[PDB]
Design a protein around this nucleic acid. Structure first.
Lengths: 152, 152
DNA sequence: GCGAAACGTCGTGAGACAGTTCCG
DNA sequence: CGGAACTGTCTCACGACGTTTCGC
C-alpha cells in the first residue's frame, strides 16, 4: 500500500483515458459461493514493440504483470486490495472513466458482504452492469440477469 | 503566445500518447516551387460520442478545430505559429511521441530556408521521413526519394 | 470454497498518411 | 505561390470481455 507521485497519476490518468480500460466482470464459476466469480480488472494495452512502456508500469506501479498476445501486449492489475489503493489516488485525475472507476472502487469496499445474501449479492452484481454500460461493450455474455436465474 | 497550466499538459500528454497522433507530410501540390507542400498536423481522435471532450480541448488549447468522420471525430491543429507554441510546452511531457514532436518543431524552424536550395529542402523531407518512421506508418507514398524528380 | 495468474478472441475505434480545394 | 480547409480511407492497434487452471 503506497501513494504515488501526483505527476505520475496525472499523466497515467491521461494514458488510461486514451488506450486504457477499467473492466468489471461476473465470471461464472463452480468452486465459488453462488456459482460465479466477482472479478475486477484494470489494464492498459499497446503494440508489442512498445511493450517497454507497459513493463515500466509494472516497475513504477509496483504490482501487476504484462502479457503477450500476438501483435499486442497488456498490463494487468487485479490484486483487489492494491487495486483499491491504486484506483484511489487516480480516480480523481480521470475525465472519461472516473465514473466506472469508483464503482469498481465502491464494490471491493463491499465484497465481503457479497457472498452473504442473494439479494445482497445481486446488489453488487448490478454495478457491474453499470460500468459495463459506461464502457464500449460489444461482446458481453453474462449479466446480473443470467445470475438472477440462479433459481434452484 | 499563451502559456499553459502544468496540470493540463501533464494530462494531455498522457492522452496524446494514448489516442493521439503527430503527423507530417509531403502533399504533392502543383503550385508551390518544387510542387510539394510540407504539412504538419497535431490531432486527437475520439468516438463522436465523446466529442464534448474534443471541444473543451479547442477551448482549453485556445486554437484549432473539430471535424466529423461519421463514427469517429478529430481535434485538428495545423497553424504553424500556434502549433509551435503548443508542441513546445507539451514536449517535455510526452513519452512515446516526444521525439516525433521535436522533429516537427525542428522542421517548423527551417520551413523558410527550407525552400531555398533544392537540397536544403530534401534535408527537411528527411526530417519528415524520420517522423513517419517513428509512427505506425501503413499507407505512405511521397517520400524524400519520390521527390528525386526535382533535381531533374 | 476463494482470488488470481494464465490463455484465447471478436470487431472495432481509433491513427498515419493521400487528395484536392480556397483564400489572399 | 505558400497555407490552411474540406475531405477520403486503408490497416491495423487496440479496448473489452471469454473460457482455463488451482493451489492457498
Amino acid at each position: 500500500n503506497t501513494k504515488y507521485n501526483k505527476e505520475f497519476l496525472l499523466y497515467l490518468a491521461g494514458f488510461v483515458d486514451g488506450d486504457g480500460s477499467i473492466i468489471a466482470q461476473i465470471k461464472p464459476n463452480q468452486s465459488h459461493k453462488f456459482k460465479h466469480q466477482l472479478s475486477l480488472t484494470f489494464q492498459v494495452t499497446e503494440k508489442t514493440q512498445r511493450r517497454w512502456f507497459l513493463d515500466k508500469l509494472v516497475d513504477e506501479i509496483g504490482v501487476g504483470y504484462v502479457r503477450d498476445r500476438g501483435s499486442v501486449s497488456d498490463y494487468i492489475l487485479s490484486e483487489i486490495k492494491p487495486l483499491h489503493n491504486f484506483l484511489t489516488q487516480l480516480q480523481p485525475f480521470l475525465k472519461l472513466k472516473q465514473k466506472q472507476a469508483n464503482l469498481v472502487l465502491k464494490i471491493i469496499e463491499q465484497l465481503p458482504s457479497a457472498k452473504e445474501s442473494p439479494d445482497k449479492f445481486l446488489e453488487v452484481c448490478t454495478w457491474v452492469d453499470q460500468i459495463a454500460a459506461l464502457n464500449d461493450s460489444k461482446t458481453r455474455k453474462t449479466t446480473s440477469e443470467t445470475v438472477r436465474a440462479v433459481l434452484d
